[PDB]
């Protein structure tokens, strides 16, 4: 009721009923999607959070490893929490994070080890290469020729 | 077209160099605007007058030259906007009021002319201005209004 909608920096404590009650009247049709959203700057609403460093960083890491995360938004519907993204793997992997003992632990890649540092030109501690997938890749007998064409076609321009 | 553009470029550069050196010499602006007017490049001429107003808006002769150029080319609404701006910024320049009414009178907009006259009388102008308004009604025999 008694509080302006065009308001900032309210000096007193307004009651719920005198601040959250609706604006009356019909909406205009003359406003596009960007124009109707409550933006503070040209693309959206930016406001300073103070979210705890360990919890931000954990969830952020979690999405990169799997593709699910717990929703950071702070209104949406105030009713029930959900995961986001590939939600099927959230229920599947029992909602773990990276900072936990994983459920899957299989099919590890194999590498050399010569942890002695006594044979010169034979030591490789943490610089060990995987044994299967190996240096000096080139993609084809014939794709090379097609890339030769493309570089030749570039020569015809200049 | 190249010789025409080179003639344009050479002349404009000499005008701009003279304007950069002699900004307060308003007569340089008029020469440039009149040269574009001779080329009928009205869109360039318009911008020269507006830029010239930014240096000395009070120069009466500058407003006149701008308004005259629009009237000649039948761009009546552009000229109206120039007169309406002029009377708001420079109400004491009597000449503007007379010329504005004179446009409406030639166009036969006897009604519109009155509005310019009525808004003028609000400022309480000199005696001679009133007589022009009186004579306006007298030319059209509205004796009872002339009385009021």
């Amino acid at each position: 009721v008694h509080l302006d909608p065009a308001v900032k920096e309210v000096q007193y404590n307004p009651t719920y009923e005198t601040m959250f009650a609706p604006e009356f009247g019909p909406e205009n049709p003359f406003r596009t999607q960007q124009m109707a959203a409550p933006r503070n700057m040209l693309s959206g609403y930016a406001e300073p959070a103070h979210i705890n460093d360990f919890m931000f960083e954990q969830q952020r890491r979690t999405f990169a490893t799997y593709g699910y995360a717990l929703d950071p938004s702070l209104d949406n519907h105030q009713v029930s929490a959900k995961y986001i993204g590939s939600v099927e793997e959230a229920e599947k992997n029992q909602g773990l994070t990276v900072f936990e003992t994983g459920q899957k632990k299989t099919e590890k890649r194999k590498k050399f080890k010569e942890n002695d540092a006594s044979n010169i030109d034979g030591f490789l501690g943490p610089w060990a290469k995987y044994v299967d997938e190996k240096d000096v890749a080139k993609p084809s007998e014939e794709e090379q020729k097609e890339l030769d064409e493309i570089t030749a076609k570039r020569q015809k321009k200049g | 077209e190249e010789e025409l553009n080179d003639y344009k470029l050479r002349k404009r550069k000499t005008f701009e160099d003279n304007i950069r050196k002699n900004r307060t010499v308003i007569s340089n602006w008029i020469k440039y605007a009149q040269w574009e007017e001779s080329l009928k490049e009205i869109q360039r001429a318009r911008s020269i007058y507006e830029r010239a107003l930014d240096v000395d808006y009070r120069n009466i002769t500058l407003w006149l030259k701008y308004a005259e150029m629009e009237m000649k080319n039948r761009q009546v609404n552009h000229a109206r906007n120039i007169w309406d701006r002029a009377i708001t910024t420079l109400p004491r320049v009597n000449q503007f009021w007379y010329k504005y009414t004179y446009m409406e009178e030639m166009l036969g907009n006897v009604a519109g002319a009155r509005q310019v006259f009525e808004r003028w009388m609000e400022w309480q102008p000199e005696e001679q201005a009133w007589h022009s308004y009186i004579n306006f009604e007298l030319r059209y025999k509205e004796v009872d209004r002339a009385r009021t």
Partner: protein, 288 residues
């Protein structure tokens, strides 16, 4: 110099993960258009991608109303040339460098004195929505845009660094394709943008109101009504277009014939009455 605390960025650039780490570098690079230094923000948009950065300052971004990185439009994600041409709009901003500098300071003066948080000066010239833009606009991301660059050594055929290689090992687009020759300036001003041209030609082929050459029939046919739409529903919609007096319905076709007092009203009616027309959840086909 432009010092801003947050970059104007679209959702596709911003990334698929809602937890973002980004670094703020004051005056790190010059703006690709106006050459003024600006605050550069750089972020990793996802698991495998380019680790993007802002290319143009917010000033240039405000004027067009575009994302600082991709330069696609914050309302639709289309390119600038498509959006302005659809509204028959044109930009008066000068093309030569010296006059552009003059114009730059003017807009700086305007944004500093006005509210400045708004496109509304440039948007105000053409605020109207158009059916062309709403059809073309992306409803969904295009993350493929974000994918890493092509490995130049791999194209040479001697790709050292092996399968570690974060750059893509796939064929580049053929140089004879006109779509390769793009320029940021040309995309920004909206001149000879090949991506725009492809869109506009395609969009032009979309169906349209052909019948009005029948200049003295004024009756509309509408098809697909079912049994689940009343006369009154139909009559209300047609009444917004104009003046009417005939309604007749053929139940075997499930079609109506409705006649306007003028063809002009009928043609005005037909403008809305395309694939936009939905009543009671049924989408209807309009004929003369």
């Amino acid at each position: 110099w432009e010092d801003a605390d947050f970059p104007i960025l679209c959702q596709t650039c911003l990334g698929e993960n809602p937890y973002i780490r980004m670094t703020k570098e004051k005056y790190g690079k010059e703006c690709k258009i106006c050459a003024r230094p600006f605050t550069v923000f750089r972020w990793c948009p996802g698991v495998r991608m380019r680790f993007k950065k802002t290319e143009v300052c917010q000033t240039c971004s405000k004027l067009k109303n575009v994302c600082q990185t991709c330069l696609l439009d914050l309302e639709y994600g289309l390119p600038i040339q498509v959006r302005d041409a659809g509204l028959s709009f044109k930009d008066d901003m000068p093309k030569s460098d010296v006059n552009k500098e003059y114009y730059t300071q003017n807009m700086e003066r305007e944004i500093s004195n006005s509210d400045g948080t708004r496109p509304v000066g440039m948007l105000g010239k053409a605020t109207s929505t158009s059916d062309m833009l709403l059809k073309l606009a992306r409803t969904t991301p295009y993350y493929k845009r974000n994918r890493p660059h092509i490995c130049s050594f791999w194209v040479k055929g001697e790709c050292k660094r092996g399968e570690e290689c974060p750059y893509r090992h796939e064929k580049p687009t053929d140089p004879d394709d006109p779509l390769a020759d793009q320029n940021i300036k040309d995309r920004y001003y909206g001149i000879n943008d090949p991506v725009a041209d492809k869109l506009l030609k395609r969009a032009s082929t979309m169906p349209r109101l052909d019948p009005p050459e029948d200049k003295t029939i004024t009756t509309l046919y509408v098809g697909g009504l079912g049994d689940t739409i009343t006369e009154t529903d139909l009559r209300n919609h047609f009444y917004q277009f104009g003046e009417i007096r005939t309604i007749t319905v053929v139940q075997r076709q499930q079609c109506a014939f409705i006649q306007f007092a003028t063809r002009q009203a009928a043609e005005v009616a037909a403008e809305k009455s395309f694939n936009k027309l939905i009543v009671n959840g049924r989408r209807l086909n309009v004929k003369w």
